[PDB]
Amino acid sequence: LNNVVFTNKELEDIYNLSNKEETKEVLKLFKLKVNQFYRHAFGIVNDYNGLLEYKEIFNMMFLKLSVVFDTQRKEANNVEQIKRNIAILDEIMAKADNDLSYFISQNKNFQELWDKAVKLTKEMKIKLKGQKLDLRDGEVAINKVRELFGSDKNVKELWWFRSLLVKGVYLIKRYYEGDIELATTSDFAKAVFE
Amino acid sequence: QNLNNVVFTNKELEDIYNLSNKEETKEVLKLFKLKVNQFYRHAFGIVNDYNGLLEYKEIFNMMFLKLSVVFDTQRKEANNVEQIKRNIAILDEIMAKADNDLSYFISQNKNFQELWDKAVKLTKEMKIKLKGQKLDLRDGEVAINKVRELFGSDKNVKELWWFRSLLVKGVYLIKRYYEGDIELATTSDFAKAVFE
Numbered sequence: 001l002n003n004v005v006f007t008n009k010e011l012e013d014i015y016n017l018s019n020k021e022e023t024k025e026v027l028k029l030f031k032l033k034v035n036q037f038y039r040h041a042f043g044i045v046n047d048y049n050g051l052l053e054y055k056e057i058f059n060m061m062f063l064k065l066s067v068v069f070d071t072q073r074k075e076a077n078n079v080e081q082i083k084r085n086i087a088i089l090d091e092i093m094a095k096a097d098n099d100l101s102y103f104i105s106q107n108k109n110f111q112e113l114w115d116k117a118v119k120l121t122k123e124m125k126i127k128l129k130g131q132k133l134d135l136r137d138g139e140v141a142i143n144k145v146r147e148l149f150g151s152d153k154n155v156k157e158l159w160w161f162r163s164l165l166v167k168g169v170y171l172i173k174r175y176y177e178g179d180i181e182l183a184t185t186s187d188f189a190k191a192v193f194e
Numbered sequence: 195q196n197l198n199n200v201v202f203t204n205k206e207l208e209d210i211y212n213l214s215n216k217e218e219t220k221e222v223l224k225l226f227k228l229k230v231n232q233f234y235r236h237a238f239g240i241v242n243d244y245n246g247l248l249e250y251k252e253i254f255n256m257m258f259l260k261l262s263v264v265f266d267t268q269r270k271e272a273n274n275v276e277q278i279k280r281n282i283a284i285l286d287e288i289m290a291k292a293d294n295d296l297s298y299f300i301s302q303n304k305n306f307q308e309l310w311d312k313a314v315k316l317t318k319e320m321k322i323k324l325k326g327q328k329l330d331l332r333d334g335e336v337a338i339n340k341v342r343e344l345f346g347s348d349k350n351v352k353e354l355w356w357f358r359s360l361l362v363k364g365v366y367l368i369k370r371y372y373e374g375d376i377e378l379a380t381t382s383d384f385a386k387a388v389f390e
Contacts, residue, residue, distance in 0.1 A: 050359025113357040121364030161309040163246030168317030186243035
C-alpha cells in the first residue's frame, strides 16, 4: 500500500520548476538518476522480499529521497546544488546496498543459502533445458525444486520443515472450525495438542 | 505420492477374510482382522505425518509389499490357526521395521528433529495467534505466507523464507531464459551471479 513513493505526476511537477535554460542539461542528468533510483529501490523490493529488513531499507530510501526533493523544489535552478543532489542519490543507493549486505551477512546461514540457491539455479539451467515448464504459483515453483533436488541437504530441510508448518496451520484452522478429536489425527497433531 | 494400487481394497480384504470359514479359525480371525486394521492405520499414519520425509513413499510401499506376501500365506492357509497367529506376529514385525526406517532416516538428516520440534512449537503458538482470526484459504502459499506473517522473526522460518524466495526466483528466471529472453544477466544481483 505504497504512499511513500512519489507518483510520476509528482515527479513531473518537480522537474518543471527547473524551467531556466542552463538548469536544463543538468535537469537531464537529474531525471536520469531519479529513474536509476526507482529501479534500484524496487529491485530491492522484489529481489530481497525474503529478507525481513527489506521494507525498512526501501522506506529509508524514499524518506531520504523526499528530503532531496525538498531541496530541489526550492532550488530547482541551482545547477551546482542539483549536481550535488545527484551525488546524494548515489549516496542513498550505496547505503541501501550496504544495509542489504550487513543484514544478509548477519543472518548466520543467509550467505550459504544464497550461494546454494545460486548453485541449484545454475543447475536448473541444465535440468530444465527444453522442459517447457509453464505454471504460476510459489507452490508449483517450489514443488519443481523438490522434484529436481529432493536429495539436496538444504532443499530437504526446507521441504520437511515446510510440510510440517503447512500441516500445522491447516489443522489449527480445522480446530477453530469446530472439530477436535484431531489430537489423534497424526503424531504431529497429538504433539501439538498435548 | 505413493498411495495407489499397492493397497488392498476393503473388498479384497473381505474376500481374504472369508476363506477363514471353519469354526475354530474364527476367534483367531477376529484378531487377524484387528491387526490388519492397525496395520492400515499405522501405514497411512506414515503417509500423512511424514510426507515431508523423502523416504516416506519407500517405507509405505515396503509395508504393503511385505503385507501382500503375508496375504499369500493367509490365502492358502486361511484355517491354519497357528499360522494365522504367526502372521499376526509378522504384521507386528513389519510395522516395527517401518518405525525403524522412519527413525533411521530422520536421524540421518541432522536437523530434522529440531525442525519438527520447532514446527510443533510454532503450531502450538498458532493456536493462540489465530484464535478467532477466521483464516480460510487454500494453497501451500497462503499457508506458508501466514507462517511468515506471524513468525517472520523466528530463526528457522527466516531461513526457510530466505532460501525459499531465492529458489522460486531462480526457477522463474530460468523459465524466462528458456522462453527466449536473456539480458536477464542484469535483472538482479541474483541473476547476474546465476549467469556468470
